[PDB]
């Protein structure tokens, strides 16, 4: 619920969510140009993650570095893997690409308050998160393992 | 059934065969699971889910049920699931789904000629596996074992 | 069930009194056998933790081999002598402040709130179920560099223990 | 009822091995009477009750915790490893995915009981004798576990029932006699030497029930070593060349362990001690390299399969 | 952090009425792990939610009229014995009986939130 | 389910032994307490693998690696102690 | 998950209570400087580590091809070189 | 699974097999050729690393080893340290009638452990490879076996290093736990947010334990009490090797496990290091003033130099990169191994290491006195020598990034270090026929084997402490292209 870790950003372009069959609200903004997002490698992304009403709780620009995630092998949320690679034929991301995502709680952290360090929690139950992924690059040296 | 044995389970319903003097052993939660005493992942196993259905052609199409059975209910995210061909038969009055997939982790090259069925408020998911390093030699044997699952009342 | 958490608390009481025996006993042979009791309790915790091969390896190498050598060292008693070997005004201070930091960390942290997360990477890939096979494939080829390096560390440790203990 | 059905295997196995160690003492007395030239069945239990009802003889040195617990851990380090033996297709105490590794660890913690027993006895005879007992329990442990490793490599499993069933694929010749006779020899000499049987006290202060605990622990070590020879090498219940399958398989493995006990006591009586110098020269310089040799031979031969 | 939930005071009956629905929706989406046979996480979740239920139901009963309490406690005890049999059949993992008692506890927890 | 208590337990074995590692007259006592610290770290790893990573048993692999390293550490430290007991008079 | 050792825990409880019961019913009723064994155990400790590391490989040797064979060949080659080192030096010597 | 990127390291272990082969056949009849095959193994690994310079930062093993340009540079520096210290102990071993065999093993495998620690990526390898290093370190320190002071010294070294690694690995455990169940540093920070534990007390505890263990492994002034007790007792050549090599490898780690997995908390982290840095700049350079030993005050001066290095650790890759830190570790090797070579030659000819015995060396040996004076002036850095310009690059990056309290304190303590360096240079320039000792009066350069290879590495270190201050642009240009440390 609370602990937004207040980081006033500017916002991102709004666009309608061409939903997926797995419940994922999927929304491409800027199609990348380069190699596809490979299933199993470290990929550097930038993102702004927002709750339902739009409040920001996490962003890679807050820590001023791309986020290095291993996509596909479940190190991340299922919404992230299904909105970066695409399971049900959803188009994957390319390098230098941007993409909006409305992560549903079925794919997001369930009805479980993911992250509860003292009294209050980073994520509330049934959050229906909102990600704004900016795929910046693949990790320059990466393995499919 | 040349070197085979019709292991029947009259309290559960499923009946099928084994290639060649495969032992019996307890799986984590399957019933029979019958490994083969030298190879590790060369085993045939089967279980249930207490469904509320009677036919497998109503819960969904074969080409659409194998997808969410393999990619979402068998294969873990760490492994990629190269789903091979899926085939259909009719035994007595029941459809018969039998398919093939390969769960390739970065290590641990393996595959499985699993089949799936339903009946009597149960959902039979007979899986038979082996290693991908030695699979082409042991393809038809586990094939003719996998299609040999029978349901009876 | 209740046997689980009861046995865990019992092992914890026995293990903390055993560790306090390792620390605050005058006769260090008793401090070596209290250590052995502690390590038995560690192996039982690891069995409680569903790490069976790990508990067997810790029981094999670390009392079956380590406490042997330790008690050999103690019965042939050697001698007596800003983190450093001082005491009675400093080590207890940093011990207590680190302990209170860790109590305000562990107790004040929903670990189950984290286990509800990171679930997609522990859904127990259906093909193998045996713990020691899972350990063997992940020790051999996944973590192949440290698996190759421990052979070298042990070779050098053998060679150095022979270089030292002979003189 | 949530604990009776899980206790009665424990108690039935415990009573089975009590009758087993009684039979071992009886077979020892029988072979000694045969090679040296009714009552005897109760003679062993009479010796047990004689060592039970006796004086304590506790000196004044206050090491009472170690004095009490030394032989206790000596009994634990042998008796906890009876949860492993697959006498038949059923009635094994535990499935125990790591079957034999538990035995390795539980037999390897035995020198801790040996040293605690030697130190609880405040006696300089028992001190040096317990040092020697530790040195021999340690020095034959490595080739023992190496041959165990090679057998688990042949079977590609650690669970004992899996290796027992894997011995019966080629048939009787699929026993590990005809796969690792070298490792078979290693297992013979390690079960005979680590148990302080073919070579060889240190009980000049433990009188009463502690002497009996060391007695029954030594003979239980003999029993578990023989049972392991049967389930690794001689085969558990496989005689290729419902409910009664269990009862004939238990007698098959008991015939095999009686065979091994006969050979063990014969080897004990037909060879004297090794004088503690050839003991270590064998267990380290001679036995360990050849155990590693059979390891390399099976590791190169299982490359095919 | 249950070690401090023992130390912290109990919940309110309204907080209990919220946490019971939380537990209901948490039991809903365990089907992704029952089918995958990830029994360790499943027994963790089951024991934690049983320890929640034990202190939750006896404290949430206080916001209902006495006409509701009879059928409420009936369904609650049926849910508790279903949960205990589920815990037995997963700590002794059998997929059929575990999933059967999973559906049983689901078709009971659907009617606990109703009070 | 108190299963997160072992982590608390781990901290105790991390601290008291460290006191017994810092307040150590003889070297074998200090090494025994070092083994206790490695135990605290190791049971933390095992608990975290039981919690979070059961498919990949990375904390358990780490137990195997750290228990091997602890074996080398005590081996060298007790070779040192035996060499000293030789070189004392 | 508490299935494989649910019988083992009770076995340990009974087998750890029976010495206490035995001593209870028995209470109601009635300077050497030798160093070579040190070195023997000192070579064993690391050899036993190498056994610990070879065990799960052999448990998981079948799913892996010649890769695991060469890994353990390197491992046992290091082991036998340490063994030859113990031969040619005054390690065992008894 | 062809992991060719580790070919510069596998060469070493390949050579190590050959080492044991030479320990197998004849067992006594190979004194110089053993050192020869070891040195050629070092140079073969070096040229293989230079041959594999142009490759991408490709992670070879299954998420376990990143052969970056940064880690490549640090592996090159560790190999340079080993190759410049391998002729330091060709005569110390024959002096203390110890075995050249298995000392070469310990040196080679400590070099191997450092090489792997630089490129290590798993929290397992950031534990195994530092422990290869540390266990070889405890073996190297306790190698003379001529007394009992060095034995208790190296035993306390073993205990405190084990506690150091245990604190570090407790922090790694909290990394592995708070980050779900993830290791492999690049995935660790993703784990801290996949589970939403980036803002947790557990990860702060992980940071504190990790940086405490690193300051132990870097001897930063709070966590530093081991080096004075353990570098006095341990023999001078392995003092040089382990001081320089452990500090450069631990700087590789203190870049790796801080910039990649701990950038999200990089504010708090910085303060920790800053505190330690300030302390390690002050107390070290404030202790060695009043020290009568030589290896001990060299250890404290090394503490001060690493305190200067943490300035380059604190600054990121953008606002003055890690090139200053890299070239200062280069000059630190080049101008500390020379000093330790001179301290070795003063101790293989005189015998002792007390500082009052150095009085009068200018008369007996003008070349050795000149070399030690030039090396110490490089360490202090008054004229355009290596260490002066290295400190200049560090303070340049620090000022540019905006660390004024680091740079000003570092300059104060640079003066404070200049004092004791010239206090040494007082003695080995002065002389009065009684202020010299009876250990300096009988120096005996000529009663020797020949013109050693000790002097070769000594004059190489003197040249590399003099001219690379002048010839610095190539070193800066080859250290600026390490921008892939992230």
Curated annotation (Swiss-Prot), chain B:
KW Transcription regulation (keyword) present: no
GO terms for MF: calcium ion binding
UniProt note: phenotype after gene disruption: No visible phenotype.
GO cellular component: chloroplast; chloroplast thylakoid membrane; extrinsic component of membrane; photosystem II oxygen evolving complex; thylakoid
UniProt keyword annotations, A-Z: Chloroplast, Membrane, Plastid, Thylakoid, Transit peptide, Transport
Membrane topology category: Peripheral membrane protein
Any single biological process term in GO: photosynthesis
Keyword Magnesium: no
Compartments in which it is found: Plastid, Chloroplast thylakoid membrane
Known role: NDH shuttles electrons from NAD(P)H:plastoquinone, via FMN and iron-sulfur (Fe-S) centers, to quinones in the photosynthetic chain and possibly in a chloroplast respiratory chain. The immediate electron acceptor for the enzyme in this species is believed to be plastoquinone. Couples the redox reaction to proton translocation, and thus conserves the redox energy in a proton gradient. Required for accumulation of the chloroplast NAD(P)H dehydrogenase (NDH) complex.
Subunit structure: Part of the chloroplast NDH complex, composed of a mixture of chloroplast and nucleus encoded subunits. Component of the NDH lumenal subcomplex, at least composed of PnsL1, PnsL2, PnsL3, PnsL4 and PnsL5.
Similarity remark: Belongs to the PsbP family.
Protein name: Photosynthetic NDH subunit of lumenal location 1, chloroplastic
Gene that specifies this protein: PNSL1
Span within the parent record: 85 to 237 of 238
UniProtKB/Swiss-Prot annotation, chain D:
A GO MF label: quinone binding
GO biological-process terms attached to the record: photosynthesis; photosynthesis, light reaction
Membrane spanning residue stretches: 4-24, 67-87, 98-118, 134-154, 172-192, 211-231, 243-263, 286-305
Keywords, alphabetical: Chloroplast, Membrane, NAD, NADP, Plastid, Plastoquinone, Quinone, Thylakoid, Translocase, Transmembrane, Transmembrane helix
Cellular component GO terms, alphabetical: chloroplast; chloroplast thylakoid membrane
Main localization of the protein described in the UniProt heading: plastid
E.C. designation(s): 7.1.1.-
Annotated InterPro entries: NADH_UbQ_OxRdtase_su1/FPO (IPR001694), NADH_UbQ_OxRdtase_su1_CS (IPR018086)
Pfam families: NADHdh
Organism superkingdom: Eukaryota
Membrane topology field: Multi-pass membrane protein
Reactions performed catalytically: a plastoquinone + NADH + (n+1) H(+)(in) = a plastoquinol + NAD(+) + n H(+)(out); a plastoquinone + NADPH + (n+1) H(+)(in) = a plastoquinol + NADP(+) + n H(+)(out)
Subcellular location: Plastid, Chloroplast thylakoid membrane
UniProt key word Transferase: no
Quaternary structure, from the entry: NDH is composed of at least 16 different subunits, 5 of which are encoded in the nucleus.
Task performed by this protein: NDH shuttles electrons from NAD(P)H:plastoquinone, via FMN and iron-sulfur (Fe-S) centers, to quinones in the photosynthetic chain and possibly in a chloroplast respiratory chain. The immediate electron acceptor for the enzyme in this species is believed to be plastoquinone. Couples the redox reaction to proton translocation, and thus conserves the redox energy in a proton gradient.
Similarity field: Belongs to the complex I subunit 1 family.
PANTHER family associated with the record: NADH DEHYDROGENASE SUBUNIT 1, NADH-UBIQUINONE OXIDOREDUCTASE CHAIN 1
Gene: ndhA
Curated annotation (Swiss-Prot), chain E:
GO cellular component: chloroplast; chloroplast thylakoid; chloroplast thylakoid lumen; chloroplast thylakoid membrane; extrinsic component of membrane; nitrite reductase complex [NAD(P)H]; photosystem II oxygen evolving complex
Gene disruption: observed consequences: Impaired chloroplastic NAD(P)H dehydrogenase (NDH) activity leading to the loss of post-illumination increases in Chl fluorescence, probably due to a reduced stability of the NDH complex.
Membrane topology reported for the UniProt record: Peripheral membrane protein
The keyword Lipid metabolism appears for this protein: no
GO molecular function, one term: calcium ion binding
Keywords: Chloroplast, Coiled coil, Membrane, Plastid, Thylakoid, Transit peptide, Transport
GO term, biological process aspect, one: photosynthetic electron transport chain
Cystine connections: none
Coiled-coil stretches noted in the UniProt entry, renumbered to this chain: 14-34, 66-86
Domain of life of the organism encoding this protein: Eukaryota
Subcellular location, record wording: Plastid, Chloroplast thylakoid membrane
Function noted in UniProt: NDH shuttles electrons from NAD(P)H:plastoquinone, via FMN and iron-sulfur (Fe-S) centers, to quinones in the photosynthetic chain and possibly in a chloroplast respiratory chain. The immediate electron acceptor for the enzyme in this species is believed to be plastoquinone. Couples the redox reaction to proton translocation, and thus conserves the redox energy in a proton gradient. Required for both formation and activity of the chloroplast NAD(P)H dehydrogenase (NDH) complex.
Family assignment from sequence similarity: Belongs to the PsbQ family.
Protein name (Swiss-Prot/TrEMBL): Photosynthetic NDH subunit of lumenal location 2, chloroplastic
Gene responsible for this protein: PNSL2
From-to range in the entire protein, with total length: 74 to 188 of 190
Swiss-Prot record, chain G:
Membrane topology term: Multi-pass membrane protein
UniProt subcellular location: Plastid, Chloroplast thylakoid membrane
Domain of life: Eukaryota
Gene3D superfamilies xref list: NADH:ubiquinone/plastoquinone oxidoreductase, chain 3 (1.20.58.1610)
Class of this enzyme: translocase
A GO biological-process term: photosynthesis
GO cellular component assignments: chloroplast; chloroplast thylakoid membrane
Classification via InterPro entries: NAD(P)H_OxRDtase_bac/plastid, NADH_UbQ/plastoQ_OxRdtase_su3, NDAH_ubi_oxred_su3_sf
Sections of the chain in a coiled coil: none
Any one GO molecular-function label of the UniProt entry: NADH dehydrogenase (ubiquinone) activity
Hydrolase in keyword set: no
EC number: 7.1.1.-
Record keywords: Chloroplast, Membrane, NAD, NADP, Plastid, Plastoquinone, Quinone, Thylakoid, Translocase, Transmembrane, Transmembrane helix, Transport
Subunit structure: NDH is composed of at least 16 different subunits, 5 of which are encoded in the nucleus.
Reported function: NDH shuttles electrons from NAD(P)H:plastoquinone, via FMN and iron-sulfur (Fe-S) centers, to quinones in the photosynthetic chain and possibly in a chloroplast respiratory chain. The immediate electron acceptor for the enzyme in this species is believed to be plastoquinone. Couples the redox reaction to proton translocation, and thus conserves the redox energy in a proton gradient.
Family stated for the protein in its record: Belongs to the complex I subunit 3 family.
UniProt-recorded name of the protein: NAD(P)H-quinone oxidoreductase subunit 3, chloroplastic
Source species: Arabidopsis thaliana (Mouse-ear cress)
């Amino acid at each position: 619920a609370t602990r937004i870790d207040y980081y006033a950003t500017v916002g991102d372009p709004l666009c309608e969510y061409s939903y997926a069959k797995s419940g994922l609200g999927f929304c491409d903004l800027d199609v990348g140009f380069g190699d596809e997002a490979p299933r199993g490698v470290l990929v550097n992304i930038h993102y702004t993650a927002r709750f339902a009403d739009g409040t920001l709780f996490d962003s890679s620009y807050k820590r001023a570095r791309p986020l290095t995630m291993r996509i596909g092998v479940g190190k991340v949320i299922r919404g992230l893997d299904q909105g970066i690679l695409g399971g049900e034929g959803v188009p994957p991301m390319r390098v230098g690409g941007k993409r909006k995502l409305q992560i549903p709680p079925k794919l997001a952290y369930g009805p479980e308050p993911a992250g509860c360090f003292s009294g209050d929690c980073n994520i509330p139950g049934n959050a229906t998160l909102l990600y704004d992924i900016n795929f910046v690059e693949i990790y320059p040296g990466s393995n499919t393992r | 059934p040349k070197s085979y044995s019709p292991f029947v389970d009259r309290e559960d319903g499923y009946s099928y065969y084994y290639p060649s003097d495969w032992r019996e052993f307890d799986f984590r939660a399957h019933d029979s699971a019958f490994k083969d005493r030298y190879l590790q992942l060369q085993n045939v196993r089967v279980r249930f889910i207490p469904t509320e259905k009677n036919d497998i052609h109503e819960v969904g199409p074969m080409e659409e049920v194998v997808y969410d059975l393999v990619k979402h209910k068998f294969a873990a995210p760490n492994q990629v699931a190269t789903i091979y061909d899926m085939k259909e038969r009719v035994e007595d009055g029941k459809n018969y789904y039998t398919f093939e997939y390969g769960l390739r982790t970065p290590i641990y090259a393996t595959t499985s000629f699993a089949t799936v069925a339903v009946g009597n408020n149960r959902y039979y998911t007979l899986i038979v596996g082996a290693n991908e390093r030695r699979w082409r030699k042991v393809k038809k044997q586990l094939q003719v074992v996998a299609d040999s699952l029978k349901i009876l009342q | 069930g209740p046997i689980h958490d009861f046995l865990l608390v019992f092992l914890g009481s026995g293990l903390l009194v055993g560790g306090l025996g390792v620390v605050l006993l005058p006769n260090p042979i008793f401090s070596a056998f209290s250590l052995g009791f502690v390590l038995v309790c560690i192996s039982l915790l690891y069995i409680l933790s569903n790490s069976h091969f790990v508990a067997a390896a810790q029981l094999l190498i670390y009392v079956g081999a380590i406490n042997v050598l330790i008690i050999f060292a103690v019965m042939f008693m050697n001698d007596s002598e800003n983190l450093w070997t001082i005491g009675n005004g400093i080590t207890s201070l940093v011990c207590t402040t680190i302990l209170f930091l860790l109590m305000s960390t562990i107790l004040d942290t929903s670990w189950y709130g984290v286990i509800w997360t990171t679930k997609l990477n522990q859904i127990l890939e259906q093909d193998l179920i045996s713990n020691s096979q899972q350990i063997g494939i992940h020790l051999s080829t996944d973590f192949f560099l440290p698996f190759e390096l421990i052979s070298i560390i042990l070779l050098v440790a053998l060679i150095g223990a022979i270089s030292v203990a002979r003189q | 009822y949530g604990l009776i059905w899980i206790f009665v295997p424990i108690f039935s196995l415990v009573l089975g091995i009590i009758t087993g160690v009684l039979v071992i003492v009886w077979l020892e007395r029988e072979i000694s009477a045969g090679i040296q030239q009714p009552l005897g069945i109760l003679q062993a239990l009479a010796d047990g009750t004689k060592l039970l009802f006796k004086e304590n003889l506790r000196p004044s040195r206050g090491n009472t915790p170690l004095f009490s617990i030394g032989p206790s851990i000596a009994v634990i380090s042998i008796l906890l490893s009876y949860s492993v033996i697959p006498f038949s297709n059923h009635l094994v105490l535990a499935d125990l995915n790591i079957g034999i590794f538990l035995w390795i660890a539980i037999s390897s913690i035995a020198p801790i009981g040996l040293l605690m027993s030697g130190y609880g006895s405040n006696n300089k005879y028992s001190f040096l004798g317990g040092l020697r007992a530790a040195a021999q329990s340690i020095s034959y442990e490595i080739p023992l576990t190496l041959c165990v490793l090679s057998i688990s490599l042949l079977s590609n499993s650690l669970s004992t029932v899996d290796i027992v069933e894997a011995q019966s694929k080629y048939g009787f010749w699929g026993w590990n006699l005809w796969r690792q006779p070298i490792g078979f020899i290693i297992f013979l000499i390690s079960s005979l030497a680590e148990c302080e049987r073919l070579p060889f006290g240190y009980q000049t202060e433990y009188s009463g029930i502690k002497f009996g605990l060391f007695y029954v622990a030594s003979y239980l070590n003999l029993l578990i070593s023989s049972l392991f020879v049967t389930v690794l090498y001689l085969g558990g219940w496989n005689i290729s060349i419902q409910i009664f399958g269990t009862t004939i398989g238990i007698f098959i493995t008991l015939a095999k362990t009686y065979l091994f006990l006969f050979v063990s006591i014969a080897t004990r009586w037909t060879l004297p001690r090794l004088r503690m110098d050839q003991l270590l020269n064998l267990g380290w310089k001679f036995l360990l390299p050849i155990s590693l040799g059979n390891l390399l031979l099976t590791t190169s031969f299982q490359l095919f399969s | 952090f249950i070690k401090e939930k023992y130390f912290m005071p109990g919940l309110s009956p309204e907080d209990a009425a919220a946490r019971i629905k939380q537990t209901a929706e948490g039991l809903r989406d365990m089907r992704e792990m029952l089918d995958h046979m990830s029994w360790r996480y499943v027994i963790f979740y089951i024991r934690l939610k049983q320890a929640y239920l034990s202190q939750d139901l006896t404290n949430a009963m206080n916001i209902l009229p006495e006409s509701r309490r009879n059928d409420y406690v009936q369904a609650a005890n049926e849910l508790v014995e279903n949960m205990s049999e589920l815990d037995f059949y997963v700590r002794t993992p059998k997929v059929y009986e575990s999933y059967l008692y999973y559906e049983k506890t689901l078709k009971s927890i659907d009617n606990v939130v109703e009070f | 389910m108190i299963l997160e208590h072992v982590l608390v337990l781990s901290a105790y074995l991390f601290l008291i032994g460290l006191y017994g590692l810092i307040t150590s007259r003889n070297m074998v006592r200090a090494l025994m307490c070092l083994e206790l610290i490695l135990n605290a770290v190791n049971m933390n790893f095992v608990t975290f693998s039981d919690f979070f990573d059961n498919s990949q048993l990375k904390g358990e692999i780490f137990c195997i690696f750290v228990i091997a390293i602890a074996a080398a550490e005590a081996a060298i430290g007790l070779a040192i102690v035996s060499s000293i007991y030789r070189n004392r008079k | 998950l508490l299935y494989e050792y649910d019988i083992f825990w009770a076995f340990l409880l009974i087998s750890s209570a029976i010495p206490v019961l035995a001593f209870l019913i028995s209470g109601v009723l009635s300077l050497q400087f030798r160093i070579r064994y040190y070195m023997f155990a000192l070579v064993f400790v690391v050899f036993d580590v190498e056994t610990v590391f070879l065990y799960p490989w052999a448990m998981s040797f079948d799913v892996l091809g010649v890769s695991a064979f060469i890994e353990a060949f390197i491992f046992v080659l290091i082991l036998i070189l340490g063994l030859v080192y113990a031969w040619r030096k005054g390690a065992l010597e008894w | 699974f062809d992991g060719s990127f580790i070919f510069p390291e596998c060469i070493l272990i390949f050579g190590l097999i050959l080492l044991l082969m030479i320990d197998s056949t004849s067992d006594q009849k190979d004194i110089p050729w053993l050192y020869f095959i070891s040195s050629t193994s070092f140079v073969m690994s070096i040229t293989a690393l230079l041959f594999r310079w142009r490759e991408e930062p490709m992670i070879s093993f299954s998420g376990n080893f990143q052969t970056n340009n940064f880690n490549e540079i640090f592996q090159f520096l560790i190999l340079l340290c080993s190759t410049l210290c391998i002729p330091l102990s060709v005569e110390y071993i024959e002096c203390t009638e110890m075995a050249i065999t298995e000392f070469l093993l310990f040196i080679l495998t400590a070099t191997l452990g450092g090489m792997f620690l630089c490129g290590a990526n798993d929290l397992i390898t950031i534990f195994v490879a530092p422990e290869c290093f540390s266990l070889c370190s405890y073996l190297l320190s306790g190698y003379t076996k001529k007394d009992i002071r060095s034995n208790e010294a190296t035993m306390k070294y073993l205990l405190m290093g084990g506690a150091s690694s245990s604190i570090l690995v407790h922090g790694f455990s909290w990394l592995y736990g708070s980050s779900g169940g993830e290791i492999e540093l690049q995935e660790i920070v993703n784990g801290l947010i996949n589970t939403q534990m980036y803002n947790s007390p557990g990860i702060s505890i992980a940071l504190i334990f990790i940086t405490v263990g690193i300051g132990f492994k870097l001897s930063l002034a709070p966590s530093h009490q081991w080096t004075p007790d353990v570098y006095e007792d341990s023999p001078t050549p392995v003092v040089a090797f382990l001081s320089v090599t452990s500090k450069v490898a631990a700087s590789a780690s203190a870049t790796r496990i801080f910039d990649i997995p701990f950038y999200f908390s990089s504010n708090e982290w910085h303060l920790l290091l800053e505190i330690l840095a300030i302390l390690s700049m002050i107390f070290g350079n404030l202790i060695a003033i009043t020290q009568t030993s030589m290896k001990r005050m060299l250890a404290y001066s090394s503490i001060g130099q690493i305190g200067y290095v943490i300035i380059g650790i604190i600054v990121g890759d953008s606002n003055g990169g890690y090139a200053s830190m890299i070239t200062y570790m280069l000059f630190y090797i080049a101008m500390n191994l020379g000093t330790f070579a001179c301290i070795i030659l003063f101790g293989l000819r005189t015998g002792t290491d007390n500082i009052r015995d150095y009085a009068g060396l200018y008369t007996k040996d003008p070349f050795l006195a000149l070399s030690l004076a030039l090396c110490l002036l490089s360490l202090g850095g008054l004229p355009p020598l290596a260490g002066f310009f290295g400190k200049l690059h560090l303070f340049w990056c620090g000022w540019q990034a905006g660390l004024y309290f680091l740079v000003s304190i570092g300059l104060l303590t640079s003066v404070l270090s200049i004092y004791y360096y010239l206090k040494i240079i007082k003695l080995l320039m002065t002389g009065r026929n009684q202020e010299i000792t009876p250990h300096m009066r009988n120096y005996r350069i000529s009663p020797l084997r020949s013109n050693n290879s000790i002097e070769l590495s000594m004059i190489v270190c003197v040249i590399a402490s003099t001219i690379p201050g002048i010839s610095m642009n190539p070193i800066i240009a080859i250290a600026q292209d390490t921008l892939f440390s992230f």
